[PDB]
């Protein structure tokens, strides 16, 4: 119950602060709200004027995404190209392992 406008014991947080992300955590059957300054891996913070909520990174092969489809960094075995995950660097591009992302 940190940074929570209204925290209940059974349901955890239910209304985050003004500038905070409301995130739902699943554990066993227990599901409860939380307030974080930044949504965790696999989620992108979607702002709103009423309450700001995290949503799943819908783009596949992604572990951290800036928006619903732009991945800042893919998992292993997939170089980053314009925020999209490709196992190989396409034409006009070559693999670059040092930062694990597609370069010209």
């Amino acid at each position: 119950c940190k940074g929570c406008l209204s925290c209940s014991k059974d349901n955890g947080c239910s209304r985050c602060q003004q500038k905070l992300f409301f995130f739902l955590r699943r554990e066993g059957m227990r599901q409860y709200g939380e307030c974080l300054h930044s949504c965790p891996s696999g989620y992108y913070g979607h702002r709103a004027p009423d309450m700001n909520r995290c949503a799943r990174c819908r783009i596949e092969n992604c572990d951290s995404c800036f928006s619903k489809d732009f991945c800042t960094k893919c998992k292993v075995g997939f170089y980053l190209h314009r925020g999209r995950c490709f196992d190989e660097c396409p034409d006009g591009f070559a693999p670059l392992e040092e930062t694990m992302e597609c370069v010209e």
Binding site: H37, S38, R47, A48, F66
Partner: protein, 254 residues
Amino acid sequence: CAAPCSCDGDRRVDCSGKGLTAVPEGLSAFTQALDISMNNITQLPEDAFKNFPFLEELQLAGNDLSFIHPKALSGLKELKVLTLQNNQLKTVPSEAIRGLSALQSLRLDANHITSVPEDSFEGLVQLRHLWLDDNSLTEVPVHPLSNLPTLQALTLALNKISSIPDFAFTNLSSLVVLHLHNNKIRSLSQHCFDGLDNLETLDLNYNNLGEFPQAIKALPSLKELGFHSNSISVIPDGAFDGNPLLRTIHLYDN
């Protein structure tokens, strides 16, 4: 590994919510990941980060930061990610971030920025993702934006912008994703979007658009265009010939 910071074997140090009023000391210079989120660092003195030349990712989320010394973050050439979201910044710290050549991702959302100096973002030739959510901006900063030739994703949601002049983004030839939702946009000039030849996702939810934005006729790679929850009334014939690759359209609640 100095207390109260908890470290690991990957030079990643977490000191979240330790109530520190200043940058902790006694930490190895080899540390690359450092987090002081949810702390009480009211201000940053001069060169407070001289002891960490090998820093790659720095987080300052929700530390109630107010004022940054011009030389506060000098010599952070290895910096890749810097987050300053949810603090008391009013103007962008242009002098602080002048020398961060290798900076890749910069967060600035949830602060109280109301204006940006023209000279900001100079030399940031490695910027890829820039946030600007939840501020009191009233116009898009065209001149500072033009100094970002390698941007990929820029968001400006929940600001107080009203309109976008022509060629406001003319220099972001590498842009991919742009966000403007929950803003207060109502007018868009005909060539406002010219130059975004690599744009893929344009988001315009929750605005006051009363006419269709023919400016979107310059996005050869558009795929998502969501402007739902607006005052749109008329879709003219052939209003999409410039976007032959559209995938979805959000115009419900209109």
